Homo-oligomer: 399 residues x 4
């Protein structure tokens, strides 16, 4: 259903390394990470200046203490002009991909010719909340609310952590502790393999952290999590969400993480005016939702909807990015859609790379473009579930 | 601009009363206020069921402790289906209007036929933050950050409150304390006049609060009755001691509230034979230096008029959001818009400013002004911290 | 065995009004209340200058955010000389009486001739704690600890509120909810009758809160709250459904301070002071922590034996009412008839500023002795953790 | 003097290692440290059982979050009977010594024959405070108060940290940065020499910390090893930038630790045929202007000596607590006490200053100094914030 509308081209993309929780990038705020990703993306487009960017959509979930309009801070921090229109987007884990859809639509309705879209998250710098200080609590202990748990990882209706709802997925779709563990080992191995072959080198923009008080500078170059794989330890670890007989574990779940990613989108007209070389074309997209506790399999709706919107058959896709909120999320959506694992997350997924929730929808699209390049594919599809019951998906053609 | 693209119709709108800070609505969360507006807006459309809504865009600025995806909680709380696509939008004070823009665009690209959009804010329930508990602070007094100040009212680059940058507006454009106060008095008078004549009755959906106390219905905006002109002219300034021109009476307050609009495509309007209230003619976002956000509407409003193919003179009524009295004064001066065409039922200085909601709140009020004043063409413009503004042009049908 | 040691004389006493939680006195800090009672107590001794006070012992339980040495701030706030030796004492609810014992001992060992002792508590201004901020806590909800609950009202071992162990007392010694309610009503009425008769007027030093208009606080805030039928119908407070302990038949949370002025035999003679009373003896005792409620049944006999005074020769007792059941159980255990217990009401009706109550009941006891024309009094007060303190006095 | 009061004997003492701030003992609470010291001190008395202890006085300054009656928790944690009378004492840094004085007095008035006294502090586990949650604060950032700073280290009248009032001491009595620095190096050298010679082995009760982690034993004080004379003389001042003379290396640190003594009457000493370690000869408290607390020992020490019937020249060893290097220098100047008789095994600048315990810690160390150096008469003095000091004189038997 998109072919009757103006075309939207990706002319570049970039991402930070993904840092572990309280880890390599924990000194940087979410706008600093997003600015880094936006600046790096634009630096790759010869013939396009940062001052050409008219509008920004940037995902961010746990915005507490980030300050006014995280997307605007990202844009100005990146060196974009003060004239740039900036909107922050929250569709929990789908934020980064919905931001890109919104950027594409803004080109399609004629209101921009150059848009930067993506997402950022600093889970390390998510604060705690004191909820009752204005009116007071006269007597009794109080709770300091962990903002990650409250605004990122707990389903609002059932007050269940995403991890507990992944257990519901395992039960609904018949995936044992062992199948999830072997999936996680495989995705770590793919991430380590791509890392070692240099296959993330182009998409990653290393971060230089200036030393303080004479201390040496630090360059963060690679994702922090992939090296953590220890197969023997992973198979023996205790469950994370259901004691004893739980199947979901910290090793086979996505971690908490810091990172950002950005894509640069241009209209057909701007591509011709500036004689730009496009990397990919956006073919279509789809959002879908169902029962909140079944958010884990919402991609099974979004992906067919995105393929239909793009006019592409599922069998024509050369590579899928199915975001690994949990290992069981990938396994269940592959099962429901009949997609073989050999076509899914070819450079590993968020279980091994990390899951900065506001950035991951854009992070996986950046990685998808690198997969299509390295594996000489043409058609890709990215899908990512989000807490609350939804998912977003997008189809790209590598040019 | 927009005339080459599919039409988008507003088939209804609704808003909560605007409650004062820690006031009439402080017991309700932002999604409870949002659900209330959404539900009330859909109840007005004869022939459209809540299950027909496909997608929601809802503004919300200070989202700390609201929980996962405020917009999704608004939608589910309103009785929408679990299949509904929900996104929360933050463009600070322009959030509720940008949400409506994104909703219109989603109809225009063919991805939805029925969209609900608007915004909500519970400033009363914004928490305080403890920023460094994960890594620890070994020794020394720490600080608890007020979420309203940090994420709502402080410009990130300068670390200045909006009211301090409103003083910049008064100096840049030469508006005295007296000019700002008399503006504020006039907009309170217009709000009180509209209240007494029942002109907000249609747009407001009253809220029923279960009582240890009797049961309370909140039917009115809480702020308009506070006008005391003698006290207003005598009060000390709020942001610069001694020489300041900006005061709490001539500034917008902190407030709680939500507002929603229902958007449909041309095909859906015809399939269901729905009666549209208005048509969206065009919109425009603009931005400039962050500390000059006060006059970004002087950019966004011409841009939206150009997108709509409408001349500024053909507009029958404007809503220029009153972040501060000086904001309305400065944009009227720069654009050459007479005050006789501006905020005809009062603005946010008198009505309240729940920041994530106000962009949609002013559009709901504009539709009422157009009907009451027998206007056809309306334009709403709202500035936002960080240097931005958003504006929207509508035609009353 | 005090008859062979130096005699200790009470030449005066004074207390603040006792304010309700977050109530009449909640704008004052604990040292501000303490300073008020100290200065007022000294104002009644003609011929004793505040600069004559050599040493201070002052009780205080929830000292968090009060600042360095609450007792020293009380002394300096009251106008005492910077040469004054100042120690803060925490024996939970017994702090104000143990402080008086320690002051009397410092007279007896010859290290001072003029001592001020007593207690203060501002439960209103007790803070909340954030315990793991130094090392940090990486992921998960944390707790803000109510300092009243943590440092004042919870037994350290069993980790249970005092009210829950008051339920133990009701069970162990067999006192129904009805009996506890009937005792609460009797002590409220006595407090109201002493109040209406002006019998608290001399011991209370009214507090002036400057504004816009000034506010004078003259009376205890709690006694008036009595509502017999509402009291008899309220749900329990520590065990839902079957509980016998309620907020109306328990002590409240309160703010207040109290002070007494002690001198030696020699100083009394030197400046020709008129003593109000003489300390005859004291006793501290302790037993099982959850049984703290009947620890005064050990400390009251110990104090009487130390004073060389029989239990039946006592004209009035102050048995502190941590809960109504505490007074009933100690009356039952010691064979004390209620007719000579808390004749102007007790903490259930007057309030329980925990660091001050040990001195508050002694000041009230001295007033009961004058009004009822008695000579011998004994004050006993239990404290969380399992202990109790008691003191025997003779009205001169 | 105390010649007219009954005799009070010390039959044993013991202390924990002194751990650094957030250091080797940071996992232990104040009552766990106190109970450890009490239990070890009683273990040294052959013929006295723990069930024989009748009353405890225990110092503790920053008692926030420690729970009801820290002294009672120390006593029960040590295995004392539930019949033990327990009182917690706060005279700031003098707490541990005022506690011993009160325990002696309770023996002297006949109310006990066996008393345990001392003090404890876990500065590592002092919390932060939220001061106005009960009443609320409607709008604006709030402050968390560090309990160490508020309840341990700030003069209440002037709101000055102790280290700032230490500079006053340096200016009042004319001690330069260099003199304070050379003093600190000397006391670190003395602490290290005592350590290596095992002179602390008797007084210290090592602490066993369980780990599937391997178990760790803390046997030494953590601070003495930190001496770096080069860094010390070049470090920047800690309380007055630029011109200041007081530094972190020449000040006492923040620390954890506890210490205890066991006291008996003459009758109980005879009944049980106990060999006493020492006899308490006298004591004295004194106080002056709060900001001049650094020199309050110069009143308390002569007062204690007069109470004990001992001339100053008769004393074989003094413990003058090193709240700061300048504090020991000033008191040696005022009293004419040569340094050759002061803190012979080092002081709190090198050993640590767990403030609620230091008053008892220096008496434990003093008894070791008297034995090691063939002395008979010793005097400990310790100042406290607020203007006070406490001092006590003992005879080694
Ligand atoms: C909206 C959406 O997208 S839905 C999903 C959104 N995101 C989420 O829900 C986040 C899910 N993940 C989480 O909540 C957190 O990462 C948690 C709770 C699972 C982590 O729990 P933790 O116990 O703190 O994880 P942790 O990193 O400490 O690992 C625990 C153990 O597993 C070990 N381990 C971790 N990863 C591996 C690995 N690949 N291989 C072997 N061992 C591993 C660790 O070494 C550790 O062992 P140890 O502590 O005994 O030394
Ligand atoms: C301005 C602000 C700080 C209010 O501060 P405040 O001191 O708490 O304001 P108050 O409501 O207490 O009003 C103060 C006084 O003015 C009086 N007052 C308020 N409105 C009045 C009116 N219309 N007429 C006469 N008097 C009025 C009040 O009665 C009060 O009197 P008092 O001192 O005797 O109590 C706060 O509302 C604010 O920050 N507004 C800006 C919000 C914002 O920036 N939004 C984003 C914009 S881009
Ligand atoms: C027991 C305790 C938790 C009370 O909690 P609380 O319910 O908040 O106390 P309140 O004053 O609010 O009482 C609540 C109700 O009781 C009523 N009430 C209280 N005292 C009353 C009285 N004398 N007569 C009639 N009604 C009374 C109140 O009117 C109120 O009614 P409401 O439900 O309409 O509000 C608290 O006061 C406490 O812990 N006291 C013990 C203190 C202590 O342990 N000290 C140390 C002992 S060792
Ligand atoms: C003085 C005080 C503020 C310490 O400040 P601090 O800077 O946080 O402590 P530090 O350990 O970091 O010391 C600062 C520097 O001096 C170094 N240092 C400490 N002891 C040293 C020593 N003996 N030799 C050489 N260097 C030393 C430290 O290694 C550190 O060096 P760095 O800058 O390279 O890290 C704190 O300990 C204090 O307030 N003490 C007074 C306690 C008190 O008042 N008690 C009551 C008295 S009445
Ligand atoms: Cl959703
Ligand atoms: Cl902006
Ligand atoms: Cl006890
Ligand atoms: Cl003092
Ligand atoms: K470029
Ligand atoms: K690169
Ligand atoms: K993992
Ligand atoms: K309807
Ligand atoms: K209506
Ligand atoms: K106003
Ligand atoms: K007098
Ligand atoms: K009086
Ligand atoms: K009561
Ligand atoms: K023994
Ligand atoms: K030893
Ligand atoms: K030091």
């Amino acid at each position: 259903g998109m072919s009757s509308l103006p075309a939207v081209y990706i002319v570049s993309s970039a991402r930070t390394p993904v840092g572990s929780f309280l880890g390599s990038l924990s000194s940087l705020t979410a706008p600093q990470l997003g600015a880094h990703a936006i600046k790096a993306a634009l630096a790759k487009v010869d013939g396009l200046k940062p001052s050409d960017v008219q509008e920004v959509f940037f995902g961010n979930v746990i915005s507490a203490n980030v300050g006014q309009n995280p997307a605007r801070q990202c844009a100005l921090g990146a060196g974009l002009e003060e004239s740039t229109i900036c909107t922050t987007v929250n569709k929990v884990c789908a934020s980064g991909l919905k931001a890109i859809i919104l950027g594409a639509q803004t080109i399609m309705t004629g209101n921009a010719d150059v848009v930067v879209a993506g997402g950022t998250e600093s889970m390390s710098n998510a604060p705690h909340y004191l909820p009752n200080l204005r009116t007071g609590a006269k007597y009794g202990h109080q709770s300091l609310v962990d903002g990650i748990m409250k605004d990122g990882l707990t389903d609002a209706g059932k007050q269940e952590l995403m991890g507990l709802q992944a257990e519901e997925c395992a039960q609904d779709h018949g995936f044992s502790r062992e199948q999830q563990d072997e999936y996680a080992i495989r995705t770590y191995e793919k991430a380590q393999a791509a890392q070692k072959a240099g296959l993330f080198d182009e998409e990653i923009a290393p971060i230089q952290l200036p030393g303080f008080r004479g201390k040496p500078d630090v360059t963060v170059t690679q994702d922090e999590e992939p090296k953590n794989l220890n197969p023997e330890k992973l198979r023996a670890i205790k469950p994370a969400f259901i004691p004893g007989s739980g199947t979901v574990t910290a090793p086979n779940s996505s971690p908490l993480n810091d990172g950002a990613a950005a894509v640069v989108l241009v209209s057909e007209a701007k591509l011709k005016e500036l004689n730009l070389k496009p990397v990919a074309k956006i073919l279509g997209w789809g959002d879908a939702a169902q029962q909140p506790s079944k958010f884990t399999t919402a991609p099974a709706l979004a992906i067919p909807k995105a393929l239909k919107h793009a006019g592409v058959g599922q069998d024509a896709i050369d590579a899928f990015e199915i975001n690994e909120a949990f290992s069981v999320v990938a396994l269940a959506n592959m099962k429901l859609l009949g997609i073989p694992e050999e076509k899914v997350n070819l450079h590993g997924g968020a279980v091994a790379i990390g899951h900065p929730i506001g950035a991951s929808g854009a992070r996986i699209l950046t990685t998808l473009l690198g997969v299509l390049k390295a594996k000489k594919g043409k058609l890709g599809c990215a899908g990512i579930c989000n807490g609350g019951g939804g998912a977003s998906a997008l189809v790209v053609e590598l040019l």
